[PDB]
Write a protein that binds this ligand. Sequence first.
Ligand SMILES: CSCC[C@H](NC(=O)c1[nH]c2c(c1C)C(=O)CC(C)(C)C2)c1nc2ccccc2[nH]1
Ligand SMILES: CSCC[C@H](NC(=O)c1[nH]c2c(c1C)C(=O)CC(C)(C)C2)c1nc2ccccc2[nH]1
Ligand SMILES: Nc1ncnc2c1ncn2[C@@H]1O[C@H](C[C@@H](N)CC[C@H](N)C(=O)O)[C@@H](O)[C@H]1O
Ligand SMILES: Nc1ncnc2c1ncn2[C@@H]1O[C@H](C[C@@H](N)CC[C@H](N)C(=O)O)[C@@H](O)[C@H]1O
Ligand SMILES: [Zn+2]
Ligand SMILES: [Zn+2]
Ligand SMILES: [Zn+2]
Ligand SMILES: [Zn+2]
Ligand SMILES: [Zn+2]
Ligand SMILES: [Zn+2]
Ligand SMILES: [Zn+2]
Ligand SMILES: [Zn+2]
Lengths: 274, 273
Amino acid sequence: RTEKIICRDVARGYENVPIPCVNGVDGEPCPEDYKYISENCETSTMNIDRNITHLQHCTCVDDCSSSNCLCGQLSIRCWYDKDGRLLQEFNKIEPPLIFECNQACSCWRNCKNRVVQSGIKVRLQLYRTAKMGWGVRALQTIPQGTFICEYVGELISDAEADVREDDSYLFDLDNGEVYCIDARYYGNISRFINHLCDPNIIPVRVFMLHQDLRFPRIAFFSSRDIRTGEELGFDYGDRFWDIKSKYFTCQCGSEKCKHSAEAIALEQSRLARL
Amino acid sequence: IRTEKIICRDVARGYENVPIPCVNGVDGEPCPEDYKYISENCETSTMNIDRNITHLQHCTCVDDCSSSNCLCGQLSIRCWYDKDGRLLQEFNKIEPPLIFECNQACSCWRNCKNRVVQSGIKVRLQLYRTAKMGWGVRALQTIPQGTFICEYVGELISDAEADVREDDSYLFDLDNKDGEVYCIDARYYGNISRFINHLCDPNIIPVRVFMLHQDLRFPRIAFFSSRDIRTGEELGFDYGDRFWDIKSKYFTCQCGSEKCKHSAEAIALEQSR
Ligand SMILES: CSCC[C@H](NC(=O)c1[nH]c2c(c1C)C(=O)CC(C)(C)C2)c1nc2ccccc2[nH]1
Ligand SMILES: CSCC[C@H](NC(=O)c1[nH]c2c(c1C)C(=O)CC(C)(C)C2)c1nc2ccccc2[nH]1
Ligand SMILES: Nc1ncnc2c1ncn2[C@@H]1O[C@H](C[C@@H](N)CC[C@H](N)C(=O)O)[C@@H](O)[C@H]1O
Ligand SMILES: Nc1ncnc2c1ncn2[C@@H]1O[C@H](C[C@@H](N)CC[C@H](N)C(=O)O)[C@@H](O)[C@H]1O
Ligand SMILES: [Zn+2]
Ligand SMILES: [Zn+2]
Ligand SMILES: [Zn+2]
Ligand SMILES: [Zn+2]
Ligand SMILES: [Zn+2]
Ligand SMILES: [Zn+2]
Ligand SMILES: [Zn+2]
Ligand SMILES: [Zn+2]
């Protein structure tokens, strides 16, 4: 069976690079039960605080590579190296909040502290997986620490998220009040990233053109070097699987998969033994 | 004989598609720094702009949005941009229609033909010291008629806030003829447009455009050329009679045009007529 290019760019030219879609597994057509958007949207009054005088900002006259950058210091330090990749010592377990530079800062738009706001740079592909529906894979090698893409969708309250029936594309920001990003109806390429028990990207909370603490933006960075063709995936979290295990089990195929039918049934047998 | 100095390589700090350098060959005035350059409109208090994506009217075009089926063209009467992104010659410059560009809700691609203003500055401009009008903005290249030049960018304020403020030299009144009245004040926050002087023979016109939102209280102001512009020509629009009817006591128009309606000589002769 051939692997056919079925869409040149699922983002319709809104990203820095195209994101083609292929399917070499089955007859499923290019997904169109959603609206691709490249930045977060709202479907009710969110009215994000964009008061330019409320922004914390830096006075750097260099490229913000020094430790004196105020925006770096809000982030604990700037975690981006000269190439725009997270430092090796970046805490991948509990990532800090990143405050990138913004339109109030005295620095230039190409300073060293603007990775996420500059958007997608790697070549990604929407593709049909063997067992997990659509997935996202890399069309190039990707060094550890590289920005991949943002988790984009519909900004909704936690109260609205409880009312909704489908939470397969719901990212909980886990804040004031808790807000969420629902990519079910509006979303970007990130809505297609599957859960992996052996993940190779991590989500990081980031602030850029606003600092409304209700709405961090989710940025995915590679947690290791990634090879061309590798599926990208992050750990959806135990909380997701404690809910979804009742309906479906993990198909990541990892030798250490934690949420497979086999892993679940082995645990039940262990608990019944004891 | 003073010579011209380059005093800033880019007053926009890399926020526009192209640099906008600043030169001075007239006096000792340094690069202006009594304001904050911003490439897009800002807020300093809540304007509650309607950004609900479901309120966007939008088109269902698969083509490049050149057909008369494009609802966005239809909301704009028609799409007024030719294949190269320029306003059609029959565009009404006296009474421009509202332009509705395509948006994130449209089914079309980001490169369709109805996205000129949202794609930003493409012409090369230069901030420079003029002889009698302070800072001005001139072209570094031929600019054919109908070309988008730049947006009038600044701080969104209410009608009430505008009346309180003292300096109205950088205040663009959106001239909302229906409901709530708002202004763009580029005094404290603004882009290259804050430096565009008045000309009685103007070569650019302001057009009210909607792009990522369709809150009719907050049109965005887009400058398009009204004639071919040669390299070195100063850019300028018509501030309107209401401006010079106020400012003429303190200064008069220094555009030097034969058509000048606001020079000292024009004022005197008109009253004699
Ligand atoms: C399709 S999005 C991936 C799955 C989705 N993960 C999340 O929300 C979620 N939030 C956060 C993380 C994750 C993985 C973090 O790593 C750290 C954080 C960014 C501070 C907050 C999730 N978890 C759920 C549970 C119950 C019901 C629905 C759920 N959806
Ligand atoms: C530095 S901005 C240039 C001057 C500024 N022009 C404007 O506001 C203004 N509005 C409109 C235009 C202009 C030039 C138009 O051509 C068409 C329109 C967009 C429908 C409405 C102006 N002159 C004023 C005098 C007194 C009080 C406030 C003023 N604001
Ligand atoms: N590790 C996994 N094992 C089995 N199914 C998965 C796994 N990860 C994601 N999925 C499926 O994908 C959904 C989550 C989506 N955000 C991912 C895109 C999805 N694969 C699609 O084709 O639209 C889940 O509800 C599952 O249906
Ligand atoms: N046609 C003109 N003749 C004389 N002065 C002008 C003219 N047009 C604009 N100005 C001056 O410039 C102000 C308008 C500004 N938005 C333009 C930039 C200003 N020239 C500056 O140097 O910052 C007016 O209040 C005047 O001080
Ligand atoms: Zn800095
Ligand atoms: Zn900064
Ligand atoms: Zn910076
Ligand atoms: Zn697994
Ligand atoms: Zn259209
Ligand atoms: Zn449209
Ligand atoms: Zn279009
Ligand atoms: Zn004049």
